[PDB]
Structures are given as structure tokens and as C-alpha cells.
Amino acid sequence: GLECDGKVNICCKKQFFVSFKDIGWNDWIIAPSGYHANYCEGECPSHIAGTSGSSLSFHSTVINHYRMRGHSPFANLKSCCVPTKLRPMSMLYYDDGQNIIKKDIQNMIVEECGCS
Amino acid sequence: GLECDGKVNICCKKQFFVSFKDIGWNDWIIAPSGYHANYCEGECPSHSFHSTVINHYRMRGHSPFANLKSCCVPTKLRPMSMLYYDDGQNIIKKDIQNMIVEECGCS
Numbered sequence: 756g757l758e759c760d761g762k763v764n765i766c767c768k769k770q771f772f773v774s775f776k777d778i779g780w781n782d783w784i785i786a787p788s789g790y791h792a793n794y795c796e797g798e799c800p801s802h803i804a805g806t807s808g809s810s811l812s813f814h815s816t817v818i819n820h821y822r823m824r825g826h827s828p829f830a831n832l833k834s835c836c837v838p839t840k841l842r843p844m845s846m847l848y849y850d851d852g853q854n855i856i857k858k859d860i861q862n863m864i865v866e867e868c869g870c871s
Numbered sequence: 872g873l874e875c876d877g878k879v880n881i882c883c884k885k886q887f888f889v890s891f892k893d894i895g896w897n898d899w900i901i902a903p904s905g906y907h908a909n910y911c912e913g914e915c916p917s918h919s920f921h922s923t924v925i926n927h928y929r930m931r932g933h934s935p936f937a938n939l940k941s942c943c944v945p946t947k948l949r950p951m952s953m954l955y956y957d958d959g960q961n962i963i964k965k966d967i968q969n970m971i972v973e974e975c976g977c978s
């Protein structure tokens with residue numbers, strides 16, 4: 756997918772540093788104390804609706820078939836810049852199960868952005 | 872996730888069948904003749920783990936996320952076995968990724 760830069764106005768990936776102290780989750784999250792989460796932001800015009808950067812999935816090709824023809828609700832449905840690929844991260848935290856847990860938590864880091 | 876019915880207003884999975892004959896893709900797609908692609912529709916008010924950290928930041932007055940709207944989008948997609956004609960009229964059997972919307976959620 757696309758990374759944000761000077762003059763990029765459409766859906767792209769940019770930095771987002773999560774500090775667990777800032778949101779008060781450091782009371783039960785031991786490690787890491789903060790990490791590079793990234794986020795998606797930017798315009799999703801019709802010529803890029805449903806894309807994942809330079810790729811268009813089969814599903815998105817069927818939606819665009821209906822969207823292009825003006826079929827409802829697809830025609831009126833707004834396209835949003837959202838993560839399309841996420842990565843896990845090893846975390847050390849206190850669970851409710853009465854212990855300190857080391858676990859790879861899914862969907863922690865944004866790897867790629869795309870339009871819905 | 873949540874499935875749509877004419878009752879629930881929030882972000883849900885709307886059932887949607889697509890016939891390849893109806894859209895004229897049957898000249899290259901042999902099988903299946905049709906499938907439930909589905910889609911995501913519905914409101915995403917204040918009430919994945921990445922989305923949760925964004926909302927826990929959006930809740931407080933934090934500049935980028937405070938003006939960043941939550942959208943109803945697929946959270947899980949499933950592949951599907953397809954039989955189709957390729958570039959040189961060869962018949963290919965392949966599991967095509969991201970064919971079916973299985974679950975919807977807010978961004």
C-alpha cells in the first residue's frame with residue numbers, strides 16, 4: 756500500500772506511536788511500554804474505492820461492478836481509508852485468569868492501508 | 872460479528888448473492904455459477920485491538936482521531952475454490968483469496 760508523504764492526499768499509512776502510559780493501560784501491560792502502531796488516513800475517491808494500494812481483490816471487483824453501475828446501496832456507500840493488513844506483537848500483561856501472560860496479540864500493527 | 876436484519880441499525884453483515892451469469896462473468900468463470908459475496912453496512916457510534924487503541928484515543932480529545940470517523944468494514948474475508956479460463960483459454964482450479972465477507976466491524 757501507500758505511505759504518507761509530502762503532497763499525498765489519498766488513503767495512506769502514517770506513524771502512530773502508542774504509549775500505554777498515555778491511555779492508562781500500563782497498570783496491567785508490563786511490556787512493551789509503547790510501540791509503533793501506525794494508522795490509515797486520507798481521501799478515498801471513487802477511482803480508488805475498494806483498492807488495497809495497487810491491488811483490487813475479487814470481492815472488491817464484484818462491489819465495484821455494482822458501484823460503477825449506480826446500484827444501491829453501493830453507489831451511495833462511502834469508501835473509508837482503513838487497515839487491510841495487520842501484524843501481531845508479543846505482549847507481557849496481567850490477565851483476569853490470575854497470572855502474568857506472554858502472548859502474541861493479533862492485529863496490533865498496521866502494515867497496509869486501503870479503501871473500503 | 873453481527874448479521875443484518877431489518878431491525879439492527881449498527882454495523883452488520885448484509886447477505887448478498889452474486890450470479891456470474893447476471894453480470895456476464897460466466898464467459899470466463901466455469902464454477903461456482905454463483906456465490907454469497909456479502910457486504911458491510913451500518914452506523915459506527917462510540918459504544919480489532921488496533922481499532923480499540925484508536926477508540927481509547929478518539930474518546931479523549933486527541934487531534935488526529937477526534938476528527939477520524941469510524942466505518943463499517945469487513946474484518947474477516949474467506950477464500951473460495953474457483954474454476955475459470957485464464958489468459959490462454961487454459962482451465963484453472965484455484966482457491967481465490969478475499970472472495971467472501973465473513974464478518975463486519977467498525978474501524
Ligand SMILES: CCC[C@]1(C)C(=O)Nc2ccccc2C(=O)N1C
Nearest residue numbers: 780783784846848849860920921923
Ligand atoms: C491490545 C489488547 C491486548 C490485551 C492482551 C487483550 O487481549 N485484551 C484487551 C481487550 C480490550 C482492551 C484492552 C485489552 C488489554 O489491555 N489486554 C490485556
